[PDB]
Amino acid sequence: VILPNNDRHQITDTTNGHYAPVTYIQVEATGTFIASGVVVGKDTLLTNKHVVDATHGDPHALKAFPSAINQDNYPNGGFTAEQITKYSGEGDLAIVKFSPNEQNKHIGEVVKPATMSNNAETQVNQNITVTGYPGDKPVATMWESKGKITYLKGEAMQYDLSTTGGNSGSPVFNEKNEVIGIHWGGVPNEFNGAVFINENVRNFLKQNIEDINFA
Ligand SMILES: [Zn+2]
């Protein structure tokens, strides 16, 4: 949701630096559901349970476009999901595995997977960014939203930065450009939040993704 702190910048050079694995998602149902996500392995991407539920039991309905720049401008093309594993906890988190594309390339090869933080030093009041694809902006455009962490408890985190429908599943980056959480949404006039990747979540990811990298 939009908050008093609405500080967002468009990322045009999407394949530069830590932005490459930030991904645009389209789920074809009924209508087209839009969301975001982040590549964290050779064939794996993280997003929310609710974006994955938009496929209504059909993984093939989910397409990921890493580093998408704008409508029909996908520098790495797209990838179709083949298998989905939802987080067993309360956290709105899901793991999506993709099959290679027509050129036999893997989603985690055309782009360098993001580095996951161990979150040892993460704390309230730290400056972070949530980068993904807001639906109030031009189609398939990547935007970085700036703010501070305002709440940390268990596997949940909240922050004061703005997001909009479409940002579902956007990675939360700390200053070191490591993924510390996965954005799920927010509450009007209150806050936006994400699944905080603590020890429990980390162990879950490690058990389901053999090549995920934690700093
Ligand atoms: Zn700014």
UniProtKB/Swiss-Prot annotation:
Q: How is it modified after translation?
A: Proteolytically cleaved by aureolysin (aur). This cleavage leads to the activation of SspA.
Q: Which domain of life is it from?
A: Bacteria
Task: Give GO MF terms, alphabetically.
Answer: serine-type endopeptidase activity
Which reactions fall under this protein's catalytic activity?
A: Preferential cleavage: Glu-|-Xaa, Asp-|-Xaa
> Keywords, A to Z?
Hydrolase, Protease, Repeat, Secreted, Serine protease, Signal, Virulence, Zymogen
Q: Which residues form the active site?
A: H50 (charge relay system), D92 (charge relay system), S168 (charge relay system)
- Compartments where found: Secreted
A GO biological-process term = proteolysis
- Record flagged with keyword Protein biosynthesis: no
Gene Ontology terms: cellular component: extracellular region
Instruction: Relay the record's extra comment.
Output: The cascade of activation of extracellular proteases proceeds from the metalloprotease aureolysin (aur), through SspA to SspB.
Which family is it part of?
Belongs to the peptidase S1B family.
Q: What is this protein called?
A: Glutamyl endopeptidase
User: What organism does the UniProt record list as the source?
Assistant: Staphylococcus aureus
